[PDB]
Design a protein around this nucleic acid. Sequence first.
DNA 1: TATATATATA
DNA 2: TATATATATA
Lengths: 100, 99, 5, 5
Amino acid sequence: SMARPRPREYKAGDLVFAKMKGYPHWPARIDELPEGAVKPPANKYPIFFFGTHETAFLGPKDLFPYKEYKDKFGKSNKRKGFNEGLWEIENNPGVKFTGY
Amino acid sequence: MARPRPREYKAGDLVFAKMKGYPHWPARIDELPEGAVKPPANKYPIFFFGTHETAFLGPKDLFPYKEYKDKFGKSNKRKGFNEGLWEIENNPGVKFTGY
Amino acid sequence: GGVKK
Amino acid sequence: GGVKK
DNA sequence: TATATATATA
DNA sequence: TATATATATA
């Protein structure tokens, strides 16, 4: 079976599931990387986690386009902030978003 | 390498016995009197110290008292537990009919 | 004095 | 609101 | 992939 | 206490 790859590049405002070790795939958003800041590690993106409003930098290997993967990863989970995160990515995906 | 716990017990043996929802509990193997209804296979009549309750449990839930005392014999607020710690040391034959 | 569980 | 790990 | 352990949550 | 649910191991 032929398999479409996930993106190798993202833009500010894109909604994703973001994977970090020890956590389930987590509803998230690609944030702004302001020019006039310290430059990030290469091919890593500033990530905003819905529900907890935590942040981190992650590369595309750990990011999954929200709409395409909502079926697999968008199930309820008891981890703190998770279900509130599911709510935010649908209903208020621009919370604290400074990109535009 | 790990020494297995016993797969057989005898009337009078002192153990910690584990049931769901409860900490490992100081307890004793009672005897199964001949001339009675037979218990299920490989299950033993247990006497719980402190509460003096009984149940039947298999060796998978039983832990020889002296070998596991340092791990399971710490004080606990559950009703009867600390009394049980006292009895298994000071009166382990209470209500024992085996011998 | 009775059956636990 | 902080950095994750 | 299937099993066994460690961490988070109720 | 137990259940979820992660990761590491085989």
